[PDB]
Amino acid sequence: YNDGYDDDNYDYIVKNGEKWMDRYEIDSLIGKGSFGQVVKAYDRVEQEWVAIKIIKNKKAFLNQAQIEVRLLELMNKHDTEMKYYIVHLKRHFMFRNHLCLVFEMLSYNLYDLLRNTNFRGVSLNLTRKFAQQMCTALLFLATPELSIIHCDLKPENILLCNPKRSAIKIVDFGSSCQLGQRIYQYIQSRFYRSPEVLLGMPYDLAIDMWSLGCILVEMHTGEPLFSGANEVDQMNKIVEVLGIPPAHILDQAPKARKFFEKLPDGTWNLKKREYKPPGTRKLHNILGVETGGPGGRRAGESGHTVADYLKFKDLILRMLDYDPKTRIQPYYALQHSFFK
Amino acid sequence: ARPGTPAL
Ligand SMILES: NCC[C@H](C(=O)Nc1ccc2[nH]nc(NC(=O)c3ccccc3)c2c1)c1cccc(Cl)c1
Ligand SMILES: [Cl-]
């Protein structure tokens, strides 16, 4: 496999202290993923640490990473402070047959952050700071000349800039596309996948807002909102909280029938009892609004009033609107009372 | 358990 540089599944065998191109000193392997690896390297020229994403030596992955590179380079031509919620690509090169993207070095992701709390949740104040930054990143991506859909927003793809501070960035535009250049129907990580993607419908930037809504509840409860083992189970778990989707969407959905059944009179139902009846698992209770927050652990904390939890719940319900046409958009999200 | 980006 590539003269002993690659392995049988196309990864570079990382070796600590290897120097690439009289420039990058590889320190260590920090992450392994389905598309490649990330290594910590020191760049001698710029005298700084960088994270180098080493992609697979196979054409399919190389072809998708070239779009990623293209999207990151496109984003870097906008001077707006908003692009700073997106990880920065410093450069890219080919090395021993792997495409390599050099990124700024960031700290750990928000799943790892919940892990510090033993999955009890970060506070509402921190959740709100994350929410404002993500809404701003989504606003940036919705810039008409970008119109970028991330397509895989989840806690693992949001990284803290530093362990002791609350600034975050979005990483991994490896499944991303621009509006009108869609390619795959099976997208988004399952917990964070929108109904539109589940029902096989056309989709747009709103799918990222759905992911963000699921993410923000999880950051505060410590637990995924909708933890499906598969699509049917995923849909049923969405239905426990938000009810049966509207008829007008179901009538247009190509895969309605994977999850639902349409009676001769038009009205739609779940296929023919493990799940709670539809709409009976209220976010009001999942968040513990009047019962002291998640697990009643935020009873008496500043910033965690019934009023606050009511603003948070509201914003989330607007992010989890079944209709992509009316689902809250970043510009309006940023004006919601939760952020006042 | 944590899924899990759809793959190529
Ligand atoms: N879909 C998951 C995206 C990650 C990922 O975290 N990519 C990064 C991109 C850019 C970046 N800049 N600093 C980073 N920090 C870390 O990787 C890291 C690792 C361990 C502890 C703190 C920070 C990172 C990580 C990933 C992981 C493994 C392989 C790939 Cl190809 C991508
Ligand atoms: Cl990445």
Side-chain angles (χ1 to χ4, degrees), chain A residues 1 3-18 20-21 23-57 59-119 121-271 273-324 326-340, chain B:
Chain A
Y1 307 90
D3 317 343
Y5 288 124
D6 304 358
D7 62 3
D8 36 7
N9 211 57
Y10 321 108
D11 281 330
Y12 185 81
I13 297 172
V14 177
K15 283 170 202 175
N16 300 359
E18 196 180 54
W20 300 356
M21 304 165 137
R23 177 159 186 175
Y24 301 100
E25 299 181 321
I26 307 307
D27 174 273
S28 60
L29 181 75
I30 57 183
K32 266 193 157 305
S34 48
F35 279 58
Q37 300 163 111
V38 185
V39 306
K40 185 170 175 181
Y42 192 68
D43 179 1
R44 275 283 171 211
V45 174
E46 296 293 343
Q47 305 205 76
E48 58 179 14
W49 290 101
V50 295
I52 304 185
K53 191 200 226 163
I54 316 165
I55 304 290
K56 289 170 164 208
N57 191 351
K59 194 213 184 88
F61 292 99
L62 170 59
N63 278 182
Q64 189 64 46
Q66 284 174 327
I67 296 165
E68 186 185 357
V69 171
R70 177 181 84 74
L71 297 182
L72 292 154
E73 289 182 325
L74 200 72
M75 287 184 275
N76 196 58
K77 316 233 151 21
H78 297 261
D79 279 7
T80 175
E81 66 195 21
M82 300 190 297
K83 94 160 163 290
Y84 296 136
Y85 301 106
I86 310 300
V87 67
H88 181 56
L89 182 68
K90 299 168 169 269
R91 64 202 76 79
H92 58 88
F93 54 88
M94 292 295 304
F95 179 75
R96 292 168 179 174
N97 293 316
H98 298 267
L99 179 56
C100 300
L101 315 207
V102 182
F103 292 102
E104 59 185 325
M105 185 73 243
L106 298 170
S107 191
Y108 58 80
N109 71 51
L110 296 185
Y111 183 74
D112 290 327
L113 180 69
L114 285 175
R115 199 168 161 168
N116 291 150
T117 72
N118 189 41
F119 298 101
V122 300
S123 79
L124 202 52
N125 287 346
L126 190 45
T127 299
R128 180 189 297 105
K129 286 159 170 195
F130 295 155
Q132 190 167 241
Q133 294 177 75
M134 290 303 285
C135 291
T136 305
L138 298 184
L139 183 61
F140 179 60
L141 301 185
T143 313
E145 214 66 1
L146 297 169
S147 299
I148 293 174
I149 314 171
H150 186 279
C151 298
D152 197 20
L153 276 189
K154 53 178 177 187
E156 295 94 316
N157 283 337
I158 304 167
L159 278 59
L160 294 160
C161 303
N162 184 284
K164 304 298 182 192
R165 304 182 74 173
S166 63
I168 48 162
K169 295 172 176 239
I170 301 176
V171 304
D172 203 339
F173 283 73
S175 307
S176 302
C177 63
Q178 289 184 280
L179 210 58
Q181 313 207 276
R182 288 180 280 94
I183 310 181
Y184 319 106
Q185 290 172 245
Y186 191 42
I187 56 164
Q188 305 193 276
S189 284
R190 192 188 305 124
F191 286 14
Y192 314 93
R193 180 180 299 145
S194 51
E196 51 260 49
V197 178
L198 284 160
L199 285 162
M201 296 177 87
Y203 57 86
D204 64 10
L205 278 65
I207 78 181
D208 286 343
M209 187 66 72
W210 174 278
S211 301
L212 177 60
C214 298
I215 288 165
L216 295 168
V217 173
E218 174 168 12
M219 290 310 303
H220 189 60
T221 70
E223 177 174 301
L225 179 51
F226 302 126
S227 54
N230 50 51
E231 286 201 321
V232 173
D233 185 53
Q234 190 68 37
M235 182 56 83
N236 274 274
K237 277 158 157 157
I238 294 164
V239 168
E240 287 186 304
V241 177
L242 301 168
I244 302 288
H248 74 264
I249 294 195
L250 291 182
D251 292 339
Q252 308 302 102
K255 306 158 72 203
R257 293 175 182 76
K258 204 204 180 179
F259 328 97
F260 302 102
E261 128 180 32
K262 191 200 189 203
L263 299 184
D265 66 37
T267 60
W268 287 90
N269 276 327
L270 279 167
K271 286 185 74 241
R273 190 174 64 83
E274 297 156 25
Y275 305 95
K276 315 200 203 205
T280 59
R281 190 194 167 212
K282 305 273 194 202
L283 191 64
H284 186 90
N285 292 126
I286 293 157
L287 295 174
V289 173
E290 307 181 59
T291 63
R297 299 187 293 273
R298 308 294 179 167
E301 254 200 79
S302 178
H304 292 71
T305 57
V306 175
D308 298 319
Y309 274 114
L310 287 175
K311 293 179 205 175
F312 182 50
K313 177 184 78 168
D314 190 76
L315 183 54
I316 298 295
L317 287 171
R318 295 282 304 103
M319 295 181 185
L320 299 177
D321 189 344
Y322 270 124
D323 194 346
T326 57
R327 187 182 296 155
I328 197 155
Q329 292 166 5
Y331 179 89
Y332 298 92
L334 288 176
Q335 297 189 337
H336 194 273
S337 65
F338 183 57
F339 296 121
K340 310 272 179 57
Chain B
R2 298 291 296 186
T5 312
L8 269 42

